Amino acid sequence: NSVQQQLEALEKSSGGRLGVALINTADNSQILYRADERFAMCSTSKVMAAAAVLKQSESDKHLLNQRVEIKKSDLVNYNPIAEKHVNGTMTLAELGAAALQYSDNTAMNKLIAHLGGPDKVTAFARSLGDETFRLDRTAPTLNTAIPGDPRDTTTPLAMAQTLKNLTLGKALAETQRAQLVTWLKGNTTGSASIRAGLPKSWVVGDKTGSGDYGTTNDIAVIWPENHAPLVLVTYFTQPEQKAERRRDILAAAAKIVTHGF
Numbered sequence: 452n453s454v455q456q457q458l459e460a461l462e463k464s465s466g467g468r469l470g471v472a473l474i475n476t477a478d479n480s481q482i483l484y485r486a487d488e489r490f491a492m493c494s495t496s497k498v499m500a501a502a503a504v505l506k507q508s509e510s511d512k513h514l515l516n517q518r519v520e521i522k523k524s525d526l527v528n529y530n531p532i533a534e535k536h537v538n539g540t541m542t543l544a545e546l547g548a549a550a551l552q553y554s555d556n557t558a559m560n561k562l563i564a565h566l567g568g569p570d571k572v573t574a575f576a577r578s579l580g581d582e583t584f585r586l587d588r589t590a591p592t593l594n595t596a597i598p599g600d601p602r603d604t605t606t607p608l609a610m611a612q613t614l615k616n617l618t619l620g621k622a623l624a625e626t627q628r629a630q631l632v633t634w635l636k637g638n639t640t641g642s643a644s645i646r647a648g649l650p651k652s653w654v655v656g657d658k659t660g661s662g663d664y665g666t667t668n669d670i671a672v673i674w675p676e677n678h679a680p681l682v683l684v685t686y687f688t689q690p691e692q693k694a695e696r697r698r699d700i701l702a703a704a705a706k707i708v709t710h711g712f
């Protein structure tokens with residue numbers, strides 16, 4: 452019962468479409484399941500927005516500190532930290548933190564706003580050699596996850612490759628890179644996703660995602676106790692527009708692929 456057989460059974464039993472991509476930084480080997488298929492990134496795209504700003508902070512020693520005003524008209528569906536700062540301000544850095552660690556949607560838009568639109572995030576991705584990733588809308592519409600809809604999608608492999616480069620590779624300058632990582636490890640929303648499928652003693656930084664069509668995503672970087680890091684992307688989506696999220700499926704995927712590390 453190969454890993455693939457385990458994944459296939461998982462997908463089948465879930466009555467959904469599972470997308471998995473793990474890269475073992477130890478030997479650069481990987482495990483792939485529908486990893487070349489497009490899935491709606493949902494909030495996992497936030498990482499690209501954050502990295503985009505860190506990249507330009509490399510060239511702007513003042514950037515990250517710059518303050519941003521938070522008005523009640525900025526609030527959208529999910530703004531856990533943006534609200535607390537309505538009538539006050541938030542620095543680019545704080546926005547980055549709220550967007551990744553709490554997946555604050557207002558935060559994401561501010562970041563997109565600052566960058567010059569979704570098209571810019573896409574450009575930043577292209578500049579990072581990622582030719583798959585594409586951001587088309589802002590929060591929360593980027594979370595429609597309509598089957599076969601090209602907008603705001605990527606492939607598990609492409610995201611997996613990029614996450615690696617950003618967190619453990621040549622993408623960001625050391626300081627920025629470390630900052631990104633710090634944010635990912637601090638995420639508070641992935642407790643039941645990938646993290647729930649790994650040894651509790653292992654270090655993980657991740658960015659979850661939720662959307663229509665019961666789309667359930669999580670992308671993470673894992674630091675095993677005595678092994679090189681592992682980069683894992685787990686996307687899951689369903690046929691019925693109002694299907695429930697299945698974070699447990701993500702956990703199962705992680706447990707499955709994580710085995711033997």
Ligand SMILES: *C(=O)[C@@H](NC(=O)Cc1ccccc1)[C@@H]1N[C@@H](C(=O)O)C(C)(C)S1
Nearest residue numbers: 493494529554591594640659660661662
């Ligand atoms: C990113 O995916 C954001 N998603 C939404 O705004 C749509 C949504 C879906 C289900 C319930 C509420 C809102 C935010 N990121 C996800 C996530 O990290 O899983 C949230 C559920 C935090 S909303």
